[PDB]
Design a protein around this ligand. Structure first.
Ligand SMILES: Nc1ncnc2c1ncn2[C@@H]1O[C@H](COP(=O)(O)OP(=O)(O)O)[C@@H](O)[C@H]1O
Ligand SMILES: Nc1ncnc2c1ncn2[C@@H]1O[C@H](COP(=O)(O)OP(=O)(O)O)[C@@H](O)[C@H]1O
Ligand SMILES: [Mg+2]
Ligand SMILES: [Mg+2]
Lengths: 55, 458, 460
């Protein structure tokens, strides 16, 4: 029983880490939308603060 | 006596004789075709030129038209005769009834009451809404603000507060609709009239159809009426339907007035424009104004300058959020961001205060776990963190309530929950005495007994 | 006579118009009577006909239009030489210590051209500072530059005080301290510490305090540089301490914004990388003498990447990064051994002995970083017999890098210790070879030299 429980533990850890790696990959693609939106926002704000200060 | 010399959008330039030039904030009058247009002067430029904003549609204005200098600011009817009637920004009647039989007219530009006159009042005010008066209770004579993006429920909440306070309250009441839908102003006008409370409410409307001058000045008119009722010795309710449109209408006009832009394109005078309004809406020794203000948050960004500079002017701030409304949990109040000046042990008592702080503590601990729950799933949690998560989700459900004004949306009938009856329920959920019920037993119910019942029926 | 007149005043920016025969040049100094007082202006731009735009080197209040302005036909020029040792001076070379006139023979203009690439000479003589971790992990040669990077409260200023004290006492070398944007509280503490430690007579100080207009805070680095250059021409080896490069760049940004130049990357002036080079290129060892420099540089919000620290990296020869975590565990000088670095740390210059000791220490600490997180989970008894040895030796090495400074005695009462480089290498090389495996860890804490660890172990 102990050895079977150990093999079962290894199998469950394998599948749980599979699930966690997919959950991390699916979160990179949310963080990148946030990052792109912030990149664009900073470019716009900076360039407007320059051009609108002139003259 | 004056001549128009420029017309840019909503701002008009007028040239007067050297010695006849109007004062700031005076009102001028033009005959725009078969119409009479009112201009309010903003600035005195050099040489008898004076720059104005048009309180009307700017189209059709030629250069060289003759404008007449009325020698006084914009003045609006005020007092008991303005009661139960709809009014323009210029104080003109806009319902189809006759003229307003007012005895007195006041200028809409005034100084705020002196520091010596203010008054302070801990008298708590009950609203039958669980979240608002657990987390962010407010007092008679205080200011409340409802912060939220677009479409999250900060008008439904204001109509429920109107229902729960302004029908069960004796004094007069005022409603200013600044830059919002005319459909909803009509719906409100008829909801009042078809229940005979209309004749104790005064209405002013500057809705979103109208050019910038109207949306810019229509808030000061509602304030002037409320201040007249305050000075008579009464106590008043003042509801402002979206105060964000009062500064956006300033941003629209600002660049044409020749002022350099500031942080995110906002006028450079944003904080002063906002303060010189928010400062005259306060209670005083002679009478009190209780207010509720809806405060739109652009792009859901709570750090935008316009919301950011408003938080300092309110006593109770109720922050609605989209990431909760999209769970179907209404009212979508965020309890980790709502707050009140009145939440002290010395004001609400140790038990109310302690329940509120425990609820914030649980929901915050639940926020901290969401990233590990998202990566590693819920089974890696300590055996007592699973319990924190279960009670946090139960508390998130129980914060929901069915409103009487939201029957049209969901069918289910409204509920009224008293304070004594909500702190008891939350103390129960926190102490663990309802751990055997399912989450859904708590969604959209009244007091805790209705949850204990709904569990029987699944 | 006074040929000019003021025509505008807008804050710190003053416009003066001269007859077109006698327009001042750029960087010339003007002078005006600001009431019962004297104010000097520095010309920045010749714009238009006879008109000149300037920065006031003082408070602008009280200036009228139409006052008479007189042009000193030379840049701002300051006293130099031995006369300045032990004195405090503002950007204009006037004493702010109330000890009276300076007594200088000679005055030099603070604007001058850097050495040509053929006048230089490259000599690899390492400085000896007396601080264990710096001498070992970040050696720097004469004529080179060192940067003390870190956040706030980590020790940049007291580390510079300690370096000054050692250089002045144990090597009798002159020094110059340029307080670019200096907090007067720390400037006074520095003055009283230098005079109490009895080193003031070999330092000359320049303070541009924070309460002064941007022009004062900007030009102070050049005054300190000019004094250090005068000492170099005499054939000496001097050492120039700049109290914060971050505030040099901020003063440059403000001065730029006042003159209305169109800003750049994150609000910084356009000329940022040119100002930094105008400064850092005059600090070099020429065949006649040598200027060494050590420079504190605040990193705002820990990011090492915004233009202010990012641009200075191009000029440094060694970098010592100070960490508030290390400082909070109480091991001052709070230098991180793993991230600090040097361009001189290679065998051909420091010899194989020093190089191998340094790399061995870094390797032991890097391994202890690995073992920390196994010790946390599995407990320590699951480590090998050898790994428990790496752990004990890494902990001893980590204690031994701390040292009691002479200038820190005011904070802790402990007397300071100066440690020669031979003792440093010998001590670390002994610890890494198991020579001292029998002493307790705390025997090495704040102990200075290795021979004082064996003394301290007897008392524990
Ligand atoms: N208590 C509630 N029950 C159900 N739906 C609600 C409730 N409160 C608000 N809503 C929903 O919120 C939506 C947003 O409406 P509204 O409050 O007018 O937004 P806004 O605040 O921008 O005017 C409504 O269409 C309504 O369906
Ligand atoms: N070697 C040290 N010994 C004792 N205290 C120190 C030491 N280094 C720094 N400190 C503490 O740090 C404080 C400020 O250090 P300082 O070097 O001025 O920081 P910064 O680098 O931000 O200027 C000092 O007041 C002192 O209390
Ligand atoms: Mg609305
Ligand atoms: Mg410092």
């Amino acid at each position: 029983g102990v050895v079977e429980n150990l093999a079962s533990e290894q199998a469950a850890r394998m599948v749980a880490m599979k699930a966690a790696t997919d959950n991390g990959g699916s979160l990179i693609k949310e963080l990148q939308l946030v990052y792109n939106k912030a990149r664009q926002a900073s470019i716009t704000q900076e360039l407007t603060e320059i051009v609108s200060g002139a003259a | 006596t004056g001549k128009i010399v420029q017309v840019i959008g909503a701002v008009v330039d007028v040239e007067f004789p050297q010695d006849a030039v109007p004062r700031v904030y005076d009102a001028l009058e033009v005959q725009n075709g078969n119409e009479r247009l009112v201009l309010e002067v903003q600035q005195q430029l050099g040489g008898g030129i004076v720059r104005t904003i048009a309180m009307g549609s700017s189209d059709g204005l030629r250069r060289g038209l003759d404008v007449k200098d009325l020698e006084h600011p914009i003045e609006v009817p005020v007092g008991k005769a303005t009661l139960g009637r709809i009014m323009n920004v210029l104080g003109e009647p806009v319902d189809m009834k006759g003229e307003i039989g007012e005895e007195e007219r006041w200028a809409i530009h005034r100084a705020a009451p002196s520091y010596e006159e203010l008054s302070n009042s801990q008298e708590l005010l009950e609203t039958g809404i669980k979240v608002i008066d657990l987390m962010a209770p407010f007092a008679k004579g205080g200011k409340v603000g409802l912060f939220g993006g677009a479409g999250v429920g900060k008008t439904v909440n204001m109509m429920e507060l109107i229902r729960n306070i302004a029908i069960e309250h004796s004094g007069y009441s005022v409603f200013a609709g600044v830059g919002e839908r005319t459909r909803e102003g009509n719906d409100f006008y008829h909801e009042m009239t078809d229940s005979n409370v209309i004749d104790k409410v005064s209405l002013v409307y500057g809705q979103m159809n109208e050019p910038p001058g109207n949306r810019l000045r229509v808030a000061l008119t509602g304030l002037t009426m409320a201040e007249k009722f305050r000075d008579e010795g009464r106590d008043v309710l003042l509801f402002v339907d979206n105060i964000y449109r009062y500064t956006l209408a300033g941003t629209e006009v600002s660049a044409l007035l020749g002022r350099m832009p500031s942080a995110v394109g906002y006028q450079p005078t944003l904080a002063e424009e906002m303060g010189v309004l928010q400062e005259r809406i306060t209670s005083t020794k002679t009478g009190s104004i209780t207010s509720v203000q809806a405060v739109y948050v652009p792009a859901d960004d709570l750090t935008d300058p316009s919301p950011a500079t408003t938080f300092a002017h309110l006593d109770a701030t109720v922050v609605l959020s989209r990431q909760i409304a999209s769970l179907g949990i209404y009212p979508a109040v965020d309890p980790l961001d709502s707050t009140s000046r009145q939440l002290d042990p010395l004001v609400v008592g140790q038990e109310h205060y302690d329940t509120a702080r425990g609820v914030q503590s649980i929901l915050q601990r639940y926020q901290e776990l969401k990233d590990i729950i998202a990566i590693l799933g819920m089974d890696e949690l300590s055996e007592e963190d699973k319990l924190v998560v279960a009670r946090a989700r139960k508390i998130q459900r129980f914060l929901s309530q069915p409103f009487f004004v939201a029957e049209v949306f969901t069918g289910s009938p409204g509920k009224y929950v008293s304070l004594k009856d909500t702190i008891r329920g939350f103390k129960g959920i926190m102490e663990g005495e309802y751990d055997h019920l399912p989450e859904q037993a708590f969604y959209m119910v009244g007091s805790i007994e209705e949850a204990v019942e709904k569990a029987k029926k699944l």
